[PDB]
Point group: D2
Chain length 293, copies 4
């Protein structure tokens, strides 16, 4: 199985993408053993980005690696189509979209039509990113089969029965979990891996959990999984999307600028408090030889 990072988008003080910080972060992630980078996901604040910003992110990350899944979706299908088509000039893994968000009670016919439209125009394999809490809709194993053109799916949901069902109904589809707390479990149960937001700040931990599980060292894999779970819980105190920036600076040693408001940056005191919540975990990970002293 694979660990895929939904890579953070660093912003400058003046609310523009910091392309050079992004390239530092991407190179570090690939060097630490991350399989692929998912660009313009939730964690990268993709719904907060304009189409031109989504393209700028692709271009910046592509200067580092071609192992990229390029998220292109949004509420203007013409923009999503234009991005999908532009990707023809890049040697990437695939394009991706979440379901159309905000609007409740969308018909199944319209949801299917949306995804089939993107598959129609895509010069690359297409990945479904299912996130019912964020979008308000579920594109389950049955609907995914009906659509019929997906290479893979990332399922962000704690219900692993729903995730397994993709494999059951679509045996040749790649099936990933969006649940960081399930890296060990996903590896152990024959799924294809995780799109792990926490791999931005602890790529070492996330790849090691998977490795331990695949080496049949389940107890060791779970001990590490439970430490990673504590970091995730700490990130939720001040807001995980904002906290992710602080956690990456802390564990990885380079600055990632700011998020984009309404995803507000942590202030100096909140940053100090968050670091106090995780520094003992850092010490433990140094002691396990997972992180360099």
């Amino acid at each position: 199985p694979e660990i895929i990072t939904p890579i953070i988008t660093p912003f400058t003080k003046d609310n523009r993408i910091d392309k050079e910080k992004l390239k530092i972060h991407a190179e570090n992630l690939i060097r630490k053993g991350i399989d692929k980078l998912f660009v313009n996901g939730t964690t990268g604040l993709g719904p907060s980005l304009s189409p031109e910003e989504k393209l700028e992110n692709l271009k910046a990350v592509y200067d580092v690696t071609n192992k990229i899944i390029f998220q292109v979706g949004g509420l203007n299908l013409d923009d999503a189509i234009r991005l999908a088509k532009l990707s023809k000039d890049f040697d990437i893994v695939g394009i991706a979209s979440y379901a159309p968000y905000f609007y409740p009670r969308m018909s199944e016919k319209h949801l299917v039509k949306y995804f089939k439209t993107l598959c129609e125009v895509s010069p690359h394999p297409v990945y479904l990113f299912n996130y019912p809490t964020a979008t308000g809709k579920d594109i389950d194993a049955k609907v995914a089969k009906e659509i019929g053109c997906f290479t893979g799916v990332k399922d962000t949901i704690e219900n692993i029965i729903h995730t397994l069902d993709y494999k059951r109904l679509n045996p040749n589809m790649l099936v990933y979990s969006g649940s960081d707390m399930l890296i060990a479990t996903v590896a152990s149960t024959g799924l294809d891996g995780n799109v792990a937001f926490g791999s931005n700040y602890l790529p070492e931990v996330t790849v090691t959990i998977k490795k331990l599980a695949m080496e049949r060292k389940i107890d060791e894999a779970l001990k590490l999984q439970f430490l990673h779970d504590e970091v995730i819980e700490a990130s939720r105190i001040f807001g995980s999307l904002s906290s992710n920036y602080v956690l990456t600076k802390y564990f990885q040693g380079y600055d990632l600028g700011y998020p984009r408001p309404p995803i507000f940056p942590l202030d100096d005191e909140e940053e100090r408090q968050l670091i106090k919540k995780v520094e003992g975990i850092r010490a433990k990970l140094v002691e396990l030889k997972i992180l360099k002293e």
Copy 2:
């Protein structure tokens, strides 16, 4: 109380706002007794519109009426602030935002900061548009009290207890419901009225329900309400946001073009089947002398 229309945004086949059609619609609504127009709401596909497009919408409607609440929110706070500031040049009722949508588990402090920032820059009264199913978060009466700066709230939720709590905790706040099926009830229980999506296509019905409820003619109000409910249910068959275009054409008699995909337009067969579903209701409404 009031009826406020979350006005539909008509689009061209090539996905541009059709300003001509929008003005025809706005003029008819005001003519038929609608109190105010809420621009760039869910029903107007506000989340599908860029900041310039939200401004384009305000401009077209402002050519017709100043009775406007202008929704400016989005996932880029700088854009929302810019729209708030540009509204200074428009003699309107207020501005509004939904909560930041998509992102789950946003901190209460961050949600409060988002709305307080908008209040700090606004040249007009600010309205909260609360829609937990759409946005993934609830800015309830307690959070609204903490924010402290709202002139009014529209609450799109089934739970009228939740709506009444805004009045209980914030007694000088204007409090509206977003549930079209509660026009009669909301008007009878001392709240300020409804932002009624169904008032796009049946402004006559929604205004009459309000009037009857104000007169305490609750039995007559409910009979009409229950008919409006049946048209709402019919609109859900193929998708309400799309069906609203077809129903406005059918009942009001002018075309409103297309929605914006992935809000796909109904096809010919769907339109035919929807009309079949509400044909009888129209007949009853003409009999009751509500429609011509």
Copy 3:
């Protein structure tokens, strides 16, 4: 519209129904203007009562008034049938049942069969008590119409659209709300009234809210409604079903014994704390001349 009390079942220290405290409470409620008494409801801990206890409660309340809706439901249909049939010798308003509880994913056919069975054997009008949070199922306006034998429905749900739908689809059915916070609203919108748990301890307030609303004094009705709402909120601090006993003793001036564990009684300190939460409301209600000084 009517105010109906889901009457509390008082228990002795040795976990038996205190029949004499029950009769004191029932007489007070009828004297304060309560229209009918719903016996063996949630508030009376009906699901915690044996069939013989359910019968003992009917008999005790019947010594005071015949204005009773007799709840008979449970997970043994033979017991529910036996109780329904026994009611033939009593001049009561009707029998009632909640949906079968605990078991999730019950078929619509089986739910309909349950209620039609009770209607088949009932010597009295039958009332549906719909409480989706407590039972796990919804018997909505459509299913109620399908069943076709209900005289009335109590809908415990904050969604008043669902409650109105009973009237819409079943125009001749009596339709009550189970939401105490909606007494004013229910009265004002043409519904038939409320089964109000808070009328155990403040029957005066609940009947006055309804009266004010029907006198077209909506602002005055809402001011009182909002005070009642504060008492309900206070009752939830220590657990409303347990707190109800303390609140009735406090406002009405007689003891109601104990609830039945796992509905544990408040201890002396919790009782002291709860009274401190509501005593200012009591003072306000005395000042409004709703409660006697």
Copy 4:
């Protein structure tokens, strides 16, 4: 890990526990490799049974095996305490309770007191049976830690994160899942196994999934799992608790009488249609040499 059967309670036409049929079932289950039997669970209609009937059940099963977890909970704490105490005379694995059901919004303190009271009187290890959809409340890993006295937990919830949290916060607790569709996964991820309702009718399949998962033959485990999933889905068509009777008769070849109404038995036509649905699955299982 283990497979534990929440054993079906067979009833007569006149609504009495059929003790003879129950013993035939228990003997077959143990014979086919089931590790323990959980008596008076949801699947055995435990909430529909009086305290004496729960005791009747324990007695019949105890005639066959002592590998029993005995569920004693209900809405009368004195009855539950009495059952806990009477279990002293039975050499069993443990006792168990669900959370008090029906009543919404029970205080955390009251929930904790309920379980601690049972622990204080129990002559055996105590197991938490966590089933939020059924009971209306969640006794999660944090509440279980606060209670402090559980030997094990069965968690009936979709969310395996929630189940793994019991191990994380309570590392010496036995932790089981109640989701039959997760037998393969639970066995592979270091948890203690499943209390599997489908092991009533296909004990061979559930025990084989466990074995294959233990051998790390995950692809083979999942193929079998996915077939068990299809039989679970078929059982939902007419209602799982009722369908379980018919499926046990079909696959295991003895009659289990009736459920207790309002858990109504399937009629002849329903049984025929259910059999049609799982006939093909049986054929595949015989081919795989899992069934005769």
